[PDB]
Structures are given as C-alpha cells and as structure tokens.
Write a protein that binds this ligand. Sequence first.
Ligand SMILES: [Mg+2]
Ligand SMILES: [Mg+2]
Ligand SMILES: [Mg+2]
Ligand SMILES: [Mg+2]
Ligand SMILES: [Mg+2]
Ligand SMILES: [Mg+2]
Ligand SMILES: [Mg+2]
Ligand SMILES: [Mg+2]
Ligand SMILES: [Mg+2]
Ligand SMILES: [Mg+2]
Ligand SMILES: [Mg+2]
Ligand SMILES: [Mg+2]
Ligand SMILES: [Mg+2]
Ligand SMILES: [Mg+2]
Ligand SMILES: [Mg+2]
Ligand SMILES: [Mg+2]
Ligand SMILES: [Mg+2]
Ligand SMILES: [Mg+2]
Ligand SMILES: [Mg+2]
Ligand SMILES: [Mg+2]
Ligand SMILES: [Mg+2]
Ligand SMILES: [Mg+2]
Ligand SMILES: [Mg+2]
Ligand SMILES: [Mg+2]
Ligand SMILES: [Mg+2]
Ligand SMILES: [Mg+2]
Ligand SMILES: [Mg+2]
Ligand SMILES: [Mg+2]
Ligand SMILES: [Mg+2]
Ligand SMILES: [Mg+2]
Ligand SMILES: [Mg+2]
Ligand SMILES: [Mg+2]
Ligand SMILES: [Mg+2]
Ligand SMILES: [Mg+2]
Ligand SMILES: [Mg+2]
Ligand SMILES: [Mg+2]
Lengths: 70, 87, 116, 101
Amino acid sequence: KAKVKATLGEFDLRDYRNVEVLKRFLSETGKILPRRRTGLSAKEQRILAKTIKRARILGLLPFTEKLVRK
Amino acid sequence: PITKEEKQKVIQEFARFPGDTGSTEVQVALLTLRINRLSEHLKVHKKDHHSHRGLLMMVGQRRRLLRYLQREDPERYRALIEKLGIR
Amino acid sequence: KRQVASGRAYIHASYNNTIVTITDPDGNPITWSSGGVIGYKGSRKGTPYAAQLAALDAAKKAMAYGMQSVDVIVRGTGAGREQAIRALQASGLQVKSIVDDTPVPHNGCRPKKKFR
Amino acid sequence: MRRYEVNIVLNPNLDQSQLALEKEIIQRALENYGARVEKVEELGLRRLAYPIAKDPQGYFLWYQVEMPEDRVNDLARELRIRDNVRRVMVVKSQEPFLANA
RNA sequence: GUGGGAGAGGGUGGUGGAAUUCCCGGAGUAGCGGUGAAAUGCGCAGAUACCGGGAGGAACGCCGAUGGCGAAGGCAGCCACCUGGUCCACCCGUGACGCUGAGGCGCGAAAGCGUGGGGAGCAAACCGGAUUAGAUACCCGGGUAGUCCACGCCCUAAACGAUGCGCGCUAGGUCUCUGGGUCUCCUGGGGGCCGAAGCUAACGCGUUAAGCGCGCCGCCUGGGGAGUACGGCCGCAAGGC
Ligand SMILES: [Mg+2]
Ligand SMILES: [Mg+2]
Ligand SMILES: [Mg+2]
Ligand SMILES: [Mg+2]
Ligand SMILES: [Mg+2]
Ligand SMILES: [Mg+2]
Ligand SMILES: [Mg+2]
Ligand SMILES: [Mg+2]
Ligand SMILES: [Mg+2]
Ligand SMILES: [Mg+2]
Ligand SMILES: [Mg+2]
Ligand SMILES: [Mg+2]
Ligand SMILES: [Mg+2]
Ligand SMILES: [Mg+2]
Ligand SMILES: [Mg+2]
Ligand SMILES: [Mg+2]
Ligand SMILES: [Mg+2]
Ligand SMILES: [Mg+2]
Ligand SMILES: [Mg+2]
Ligand SMILES: [Mg+2]
Ligand SMILES: [Mg+2]
Ligand SMILES: [Mg+2]
Ligand SMILES: [Mg+2]
Ligand SMILES: [Mg+2]
Ligand SMILES: [Mg+2]
Ligand SMILES: [Mg+2]
Ligand SMILES: [Mg+2]
Ligand SMILES: [Mg+2]
Ligand SMILES: [Mg+2]
Ligand SMILES: [Mg+2]
Ligand SMILES: [Mg+2]
Ligand SMILES: [Mg+2]
Ligand SMILES: [Mg+2]
Ligand SMILES: [Mg+2]
Ligand SMILES: [Mg+2]
Ligand SMILES: [Mg+2]
C-alpha cells in the first residue's frame, strides 16, 4: 500500500489552512493516520498532528466521521 | 523576556574591557537581571514551583561567584555589589 | 397511515439486548422492536437469533407502514450485532447503505468499575 | 511587537452592509490595540467539515500582523465579543517547515 | 558569550469537539435495564430507541510509541502570555571560581483536614436485589463524603531502576529520540536491547556498571516483640518525625 508522503509534493507541514493536503493524512474516519500509513518521521508526524488539530478547530478538518459498509 | 537588546545593553554596561563577555562582573550582572525577572514573575504566580527551584539555583550560582570575587579582589567586589544593589 | 416509502434503520446492539428502530429520512421514528418485544425475556434477548427476529419484526412493521428503501445505522457491539443486519438485508428491504456510528467519547467521563 | 496570524470565521449569510460593518469593526479593533497589518487574505464562503453555530458554512479571514505581545489576549477577547464572529484563533507566526523536500 | 534546537517542564487566562447526565420539544409503543441465571430498579404521569434545541460538570479519542520532559512527586485537546531546565555548533570571554553536603529551608501521588465554592460521571460509608451452609464479600440496582476549583494544613508510599551524587578509566553489536557534520557513514547528547574483560551467592550487571578507582553524604549489624512503649518536636485533627 502507498504511504501518504510517497505520493505528495513539497508541501508545508505547518500550514493549518491547506485542507486539500491535510485531508490526505486523515483516515476514512476523522482519525489521524499512524506513521505506518503516513510514511512520516517522528518530528514530521508530531508537527502534522498539531497542524491537523489547528485545522479541526477552524472547522476545516472533521473531528470525527462515520464508517461505511460495516 | 530578555531579548538581545537588553542583554547586550547590560553586557556592554558591565564589561571589564571592550569585547569581554564572561567576566565575573558580567556573569553576576546577567545573573542578577534574570534573578529580578524571575522574582517579579514569582510575585504573581505563587504556585509556580519549578521556576522557583530555577531561581534557587540562580541565587546559588550568583552567590558562589560573589564569594569568589570577594576572595580574589575585594574592591571590585564592593564596586559590583554597590552597582547592582545586593547583599 | 404514513406511507413513508423510504427511511433509516438504527440498530442498537449491546451484550444484554439488541433493538431496532425504523425511522423516516429526517429522524423521527416509525416502528421499533427488540428481544423483549418478541417472546424472549432474560439473557435470551442478547442472542443473535433474538436480534434477527427483532430486525425482521421491525422490518415487517415498516412494511405495514410501506417501507421499501432503507439506510442502516449501527451503534454498539454485541452478539447478533451483525445478524440483525443480515436479517435486515434478507428481510425484503432494499438496503441503501450500512453505517457504523457507534458513539465513542474523547475520554470525557469516568467509567464504572466494570469498565476499567 | 511580534508577528501573529489572526483567523476569523464569521457568519456567511451577511450582505454587503453587514459584512463591511463587521470587517471595519475588526479593523478598528486592530487599530485600537496597535496591530500593524502586514497582509490580508479573504477566502470567504467555505464548506465546513462540521456545522458551526447551526450553519454548515462559514466566511473566512486571515490577517498577518505585527503587534505587541501583552495585548494579544485582550484583542482576541474584543474580537470574540462580536456576535457574528463565530471563531477567533490568533496564532504566533512561524517558519514554513517543509516535508518531502 | 554568540548562534541554532527538541520537549504532556511549571504558572496564568482563554478556547474546541466527542461522550455521559439532566431539561424543552417532535415523532413513536411495551418494555428497558441487568446477570452464569436472575431480582431489586425504571416505564401508561409515555420509558428505552430516534431526531432537533438547551444547560452543566469532568476528562482530552485518533496522533501515541517499546516516545518525550522534569530533581523527584509527577506532566497529554488547541491558543496566547509569563517562566524553569537542558542539548549542540563556534573556540570568543573569566581563569580552579570545583565536588559532596550533618543541620536548616523548599518541593512532595493518592487519601485525609479546615473555610468557601462546585457537582455531570464515578463512588468509601450506607440503602436495597441476588449468590451461599451463612454473604457483613465478590455480581446487580441506587447512593453520601469524596473525586473538581480557590486558599491554608497534612510530609506518608512497592515516593522503585527496591540501585545517593560527582569525576575519570575499561570490546563491540543492534533499535531508537534529538543536534552538528565533508550526511553507505561519522560525531555529541538521551532512551532500550544483546553482549568483551571483569563483577556476583546465584539471578543477573556489563560506557545508562551491580566493573576498575577517588571524594563526600545517608543507612545496616539475627527473627518475633515493633515502627510498639516512654520522652521530645510538629499537626486543627487524623497522625507524622
Ligand atoms: Mg438481557
Ligand atoms: Mg462570537
Ligand atoms: Mg507542557
Ligand atoms: Mg502548561
Ligand atoms: Mg420526551
Ligand atoms: Mg409504572
Ligand atoms: Mg413498576
Ligand atoms: Mg409509577
Ligand atoms: Mg447542574
Ligand atoms: Mg495509545
Ligand atoms: Mg524554554
Ligand atoms: Mg580560549
Ligand atoms: Mg588570560
Ligand atoms: Mg548539590
Ligand atoms: Mg538535607
Ligand atoms: Mg502531599
Ligand atoms: Mg488530594
Ligand atoms: Mg476538602
Ligand atoms: Mg453508578
Ligand atoms: Mg441477603
Ligand atoms: Mg455499587
Ligand atoms: Mg556507594
Ligand atoms: Mg543529520
Ligand atoms: Mg530524563
Ligand atoms: Mg548513546
Ligand atoms: Mg547503546
Ligand atoms: Mg565471562
Ligand atoms: Mg543485560
Ligand atoms: Mg560510574
Ligand atoms: Mg553487588
Ligand atoms: Mg531507621
Ligand atoms: Mg532481637
Ligand atoms: Mg506507621
Ligand atoms: Mg508521642
Ligand atoms: Mg499538641
Ligand atoms: Mg497510620
């Protein structure tokens, strides 16, 4: 399976406003994806988590979602 | 907090000679500056205990340097103390 | 006396019971059923067969209301949490979609001694 | 004076009199607290991920400013007191940490 | 000193969503809940389930790790402010200014105390239902103090790495966090795992020493009696030394 960073550009991990690329790092639900599927380093993941939370509070990223087909 | 403007102001104020950075006088000056900053931070925020431990250690280091200065040259020690208003 | 022709179906399954509430597209319920609505009384209500029978009874009451297309919502975990959906699929109601919306807190409340 | 970024999400359904009024009130709040406005980006209508104040959408504003530190919280409060302003997040500016460089 | 860096380190104020409970409303019948079975309990004054709205308290899912920070206790949503510690590079400044530390002083999980707030969920005591030879328990339904906040006490613990602090010396390999570098790699500084020499009664330790040395502090001298008695000190008390 593909990891998120593998298929992506040279993007800002500190931009909480870019929903287009921050959406890639959320799961089918609103959960933040682990490092196994994001292909990020520890520091990169630690920054991405805070930026994702920032975007969530701004109503840009979903706090949680609903699972399908279950 | 303490930016490079205020820091360099104090250093150039307490230098034994142009270019000196780590003289006992300058060390005690910067120490006392951070001491007063923290002690004013501890006038409010009485429940900040870890910063108070840091203040204890800063007081200890300043007192050790002052003891050393008093042991080596008492006159420069008196000048420093009167200039900073301590003890 | 409603002629709803389409709606949602919520399956609340626990380890002590399973209940199905069939509702309209804007949330108001139409019919419902459970392991106690049908004959079973005690722990028998938590068996997958009771869940199947409850889903089927609720689906037939929905037929009485005139239900054809159904969207499924699932909350909770227990025996027959899936069997309810299987019977609901083969009940004669065209299943639109199945969704698991089990409510999980963000670590807000302290659980009972059983749950720690 | 430090560099900050003010995000403002307010009611989308405003017309031009109301929107210009709220924006000029934000401007007066920035003036009164010593906020030098370095740049501005107005996104406007956007689809929220979750409903905010019973509305599935919101109107967005982003201001990069330079203002004194001890006034940021009071400025945030005064910006929040307005009814139509539903979200205020003031963030200290930072450098663009990149990835997959 | 200069210039960079990582962080649930601490304090203050703000702020977000999920969930529980409760209240208002809509729609909707006959049960829900609970267990190994059950019953107390709740429901026709309309519950449970579903939808919308409101209130309030407490805690921060995914990220999260075998991770990080702190002297220890301990510290996880986000934002801002105030502030501590620490690491690296430059080789710049002072010129032994050092290490340890009886006493003292400060900090010190939870529970507990006092005054005043707060109170969703949980829950000692307690009230019931079961189980059993009996049930004063485990299991179920309720439920007060408390848990939460402000301020002042309390000074205990498996307060654990059951390993005091500092420095130097003594094979490496492997995983990792964070810096620097001419960036298959090297070089610092933390977190683990194997394992040289050596140590150990053995288990095991082994550059994060329980190895080889040095400095200083604390403590030990068979078990029970007993962390008891008396005395003193501290504490509102419980009680602690
Ligand atoms: Mg049952
Ligand atoms: Mg507002
Ligand atoms: Mg912190
Ligand atoms: Mg903090
Ligand atoms: Mg009602
Ligand atoms: Mg009744
Ligand atoms: Mg009754
Ligand atoms: Mg009654
Ligand atoms: Mg209340
Ligand atoms: Mg976890
Ligand atoms: Mg800092
Ligand atoms: Mg030199
Ligand atoms: Mg010289
Ligand atoms: Mg010491
Ligand atoms: Mg002592
Ligand atoms: Mg204590
Ligand atoms: Mg306590
Ligand atoms: Mg109390
Ligand atoms: Mg309870
Ligand atoms: Mg009995
Ligand atoms: Mg109980
Ligand atoms: Mg020793
Ligand atoms: Mg590197
Ligand atoms: Mg450490
Ligand atoms: Mg190492
Ligand atoms: Mg190693
Ligand atoms: Mg050997
Ligand atoms: Mg070993
Ligand atoms: Mg050693
Ligand atoms: Mg030994
Ligand atoms: Mg003793
Ligand atoms: Mg004896
Ligand atoms: Mg005792
Ligand atoms: Mg006594
Ligand atoms: Mg007395
Ligand atoms: Mg006792």
